[PDB]
């Protein structure tokens, strides 16, 4: 449905996974937002005071919405499309083991996908798109938005 009317957008990390150290969580999330700001007029800013447009939450099982997480494996993450309140928020399953690299579920890659939803994208049919609804680890230096991702997001934020 609706897209952000404004081009200045805040995010707050509600809480931290104990799987990675704090600085690595910040880094992953920052880099994930950068991916999208790189191809749009959107500007993202992290806050810890006031109210963020996008709340980033790590939680297991039932966590206050109607989409409970399911333990280790399966559902990794979900996010809500643009809007007030819960709109834009991105939730990560704490029962996953979040990693800077290949040996669990990579936070950066998962967050790029989740944030795509937070900005209003649905799933892609293109297996090389970040919005493809299958997790597959890629070298975070071999990482790139596909043409379908870029086309998609630019159709929303021209």
Comparison of 65 and 126: residue with beta carbon closer to Zn ion:
65
| Residue 144 to residue 56: CA distance in whole angstroms | 22
Taking CB within 5 to 8 Å according to partner kind, which of Ca ion, ligand CGS, Zn ion, none is near residue 111? none
Residue 48 near residue 32, CB atoms below 8 Å: no
Minimum distance from CB of 95 to Ca ion (Å)?
A: 5
91 touches Zn ion by CB under 5 A: yes
26 touches Ca ion by CB under 5 A: no
Burial pattern 46-65, b for ≥16 Cβ within 10 A else e, equals eeeeeebbbbbbbbeeeeee
| Residue 46 to residue 153: CA distance in whole angstroms | 21
Comparison of 83 and 126: residue with beta carbon closer to Ca ion:
83
Taking CB within 5 to 8 Å according to partner kind, which of Zn ion, ligand CGS, Ca ion, none is near residue 115? none
Count the site residues for ligand CGS by CB under 6 A.
13
| Residue 67 to residue 52: CA distance in whole angstroms | 21
135 touches ligand CGS by CB under 6 A: yes
């Amino acid at each position: 449905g609706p897209v952000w009317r404004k081009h200045y957008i805040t995010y707050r990390i509600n809480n931290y996974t104990p799987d990675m150290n704090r600085e690595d969580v910040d880094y992953a999330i920052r880099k994930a937002f950068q991916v999208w700001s790189n191809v749009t007029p959107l500007k993202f800013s992290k806050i810890n005071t006031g109210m963020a447009d996008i709340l980033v939450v790590f939680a297991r099982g039932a966590h206050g919405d109607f989409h409970a997480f399911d333990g280790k494996g399966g559902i990794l993450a979900h996010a809500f499309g643009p809007g007030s309140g819960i709109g834009g928020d991105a939730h990560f399953d704490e029962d996953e083991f979040w990693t800077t690299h290949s040996g669990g579920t990579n936070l950066f890659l998962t967050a790029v996908h989740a944030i795509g939803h937070s900005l209003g994208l649905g799933h892609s049919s293109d297996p090389k798109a970040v919005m493809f609804p299958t997790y597959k680890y890629v070298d975070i230096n071999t990482f790139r938005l596909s043409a379908d991702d870029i086309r998609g997001i630019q159709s929303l934020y021209g």
